[PDB]
Design a protein around this nucleic acid. Structure first.
Ligand SMILES: [Mn+2]
Ligand code: NA
Ligand code: NA
Length: 327
DNA sequence: CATTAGA
DNA sequence: TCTAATGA
């Protein structure tokens, strides 16, 4: 956690570089198990050899360890940090919708900067076109102060359409958080469950509404159960318009809300833990359900959940407010 | 790990 | 169809 720091640190640095710049998934994959391990290691690593004893730690890596232990640096790390091409891929990749593959291809053609990207909006597809467009607005955090106004509106419309609609805004905001990256609305409805073969309108109606009133300004991807877009709060009485925000909305088979909800509410850790706990408690929890466990190694049979609690009760735990779903 | 765009 | 990119 701190003793292993630089190590894992230079390690993750390294991996990442293989994967993105190079298309070396293996090496990339190597940097990771190793990084993953030295990570767990309970003592201050003193040299290659020592580390070398570890599984995943080969000679290639060990070797880097020493150089790094000797000089608080690495050549390759230094060379790459310098590396144009590579610096370029690291950067492009930030555009929403630009992943490595594209970032390399772009670069190959010679698009290194944001401006290059502009002069070549044509080579860019819709997603990236928007990503390029709200580049600044996307990189910025969402003040809760705004999250509340966002949530406000969303709830109102949803209800306005059909009153049956149930809608919870998840993530860190749900967990008290000061700011958030994008907004995640879970959604469901009574007429939509596990069996009852969809009703795509279910999603559509809503997006229609939000778009109607000018909340959703664009669409990244709208499909039958997952819509990814961009919203923005009505820019009041001039002088101050609001930044373009990422919003995501997902349809849920009503018979799987709470799990789904319990889940997305996190946190990444409180989840694992809870998960790690339901296990002993003879269960199974996944993004959408909770099934009692059985001794032949495994078992199924999805228990019925009516709220966040049921799941608790089941694994018999303390209902813990979202506020405290920290870990 | 599953959902969407695209070519 | 596969292959990418987001998210989780
Ligand atoms: Mn999120
Ligand atoms: Na070894
Ligand atoms: Na990106």
């Amino acid at each position: 956690e701190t003793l292993n720091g630089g190590i894992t640190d230079m390690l993750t640095e390294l991996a990442n570089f293989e994967k993105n710049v190079s298309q070396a998934i293996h090496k990339y994959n190597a940097y990771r198990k190793a990084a993953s391990v030295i990570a767990k290691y309970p003592h201050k690593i003193k040299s290659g050899a020592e580390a070398k004893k570890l599984p995943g730690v080969g000679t290639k890596i060990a070797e880097k360890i020493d150089e790094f232990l000797a000089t608080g640096k690495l050549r390759k790390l230094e060379k790459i940090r310098q590396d144009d091409t590579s610096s370029s891929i690291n950067f492009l990749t930030r555009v929403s919708g630009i992943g490595p593959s594209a970032a390399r291809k772009f670069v190959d053609e010679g698009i290194k900067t944001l401006e290059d990207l502009r002069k070549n909006e044509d080579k860019l597809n819709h997603h990236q076109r928007i990503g390029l467009k709200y580049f600044g607005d996307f990189e910025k955090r969402i003040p809760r102060e705004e999250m509340l106004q966002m949530q406000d509106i969303v709830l109102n419309e949803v209800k306005k359409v059909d009153s049956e609609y149930i809608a919870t805004v998840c993530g860190s905001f749900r967990r008290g958080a000061e700011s958030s990256g994008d907004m995640d609305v879970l959604l469901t409805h009574p007429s939509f469950t596990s069996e009852s073969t969809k009703q795509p309108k279910l999603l559509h109606q809503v997006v229609e509404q939000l778009q109607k009133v000018h909340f959703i300004t664009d669409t990244l991807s709208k499909g039958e159960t997952k819509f990814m877009g961009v919203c923005q709060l009505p820019s009041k009485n001039d002088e101050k318009e609001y930044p373009h925000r990422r919003i995501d909305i997902r349809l849920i088979p009503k018979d799987q809300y709470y799990c789904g909800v319990l889940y997305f509410t996190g946190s990444d850790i409180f989840n694992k833990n809870m998960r790690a706990h339901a296990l002993e408690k003879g269960f199974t929890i996944n993004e959408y359900t909770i099934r009692p466990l059985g001794v032949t190694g495994v078992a199924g049979e999805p228990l019925p959940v009516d709220s966040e609690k049921d799941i608790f009760d089941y694994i018999q735990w303390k209902y813990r407010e979202p506020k405290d779903r920290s870990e």
